[PDB]
Amino acid sequence: YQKRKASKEYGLYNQCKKLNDDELFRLLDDHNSLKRISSARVLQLRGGQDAVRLAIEFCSDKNYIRRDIGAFILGQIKICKKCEDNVFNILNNMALNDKSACVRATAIESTAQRCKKNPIYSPKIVEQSQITAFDKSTNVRRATAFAISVIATIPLLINLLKDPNGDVRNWAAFAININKYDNSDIRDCFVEMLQDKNEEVRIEAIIGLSYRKDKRVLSVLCDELKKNTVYDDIIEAAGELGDKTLLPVLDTMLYKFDDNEIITSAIDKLKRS
């Protein structure tokens, strides 16, 4: 049933590919953002020594737009084995010391890219997040959330759950669920998130608490299952929680929704054990 359509930028990206390096390099200084990014994407794809060097130099430019673009390119472009450490160090440093929060955010995302391709950088990514997770910029903290997920960081994760930004909290919780991290602190933060103003965050807290079999989610779970429009994840969490208190309502829902298979699944799980 599900499908997907090609990105709206793809067309423009293919046009950029027809251009030579010299032309792409110039486009990095275009006034349009999308134009700069598209060009850089082509550079990350074909990127050779001339593109790597230029990216590095851009990393030291007075214009933060060039620094951002250089660090972006550097996160995915191929680089010789003898320049890899230096590029990583260049990104790590910007992530921590660039005067532009935009640059810092991009650089952290680029150090993440590089680590995934070569895990030797993990230890450094951790030390890096130990300070960047506390940056004053939300973009930076957000990028830090992404970074951490690429690789304890638990304590950092916990502080991000308490972030003023909803997007940051969602990513933290999201990565905690992904790694199945669990302790009294995370559970308590999830219980509190049941009252988060951000629907997306409440959902991750609900699935997180249910996988953990923590009955403090019961009340909210019950409320969510009684809605006219219900979230599939909620129904699924209901089965994961393993508390038979939810059987009655699940049974009721069977006659409420045309496709109640997912409901039956949750019911099957409950009746077990």
Method: X-ray
Is residue 187 within 8 Å of residue 214, measured between CB atoms? yes
- Give the largest CA-CA distance in the chain: 68
Question: In this structure, what CATH number is given to the domain that contains residue 54?
Answer: 1.25.10.10
Residues 6+ apart with CB under 8 A from 130: 156
Separation CA 206–CA 270 (nearest Å):
17
Closest CA to 12 of 31, 40, 46: 40
Token pair belonging to 145: 């959330």
Instruction: Let me know the angle formed at the C-alpha of 209 by 205 and 271, rounded to the nearest 5 degrees.
Output: 130
The boundaries of the domain holding residue 153 are: 1-273
Which resolution, in Å, applies to this structure? 2.1
Residue appearing with tokens 């009684």: 226
Structural domain count of the chain: 1
Secondary structure, 3-state, the chain: CCCCCCCCCHHHHHHHHCCCHHHHHHHCCCCCHHHHHHHHHHHHHHCCHHHHHHHHHHCCCCCHHHHHHHHHHHHHCCCCCCCHHHHHHHHHHHHHHCCCHHHHHHHHHHHHHHHHHCHHHHHHHHHHHHHHCCCCCHHHHHHHHHHHHCCCCHHHHHHHHCCCCHHHHHHHHHHHHHHCCCCHHHHHHHHHHCCCCCHHHHHHHHHHHHHCCCHHHHHHHHHHHCCCCCCHHHHHHHHHHCCHHHHHHHHHHHCCCCCCHHHHHHHHHHCCC
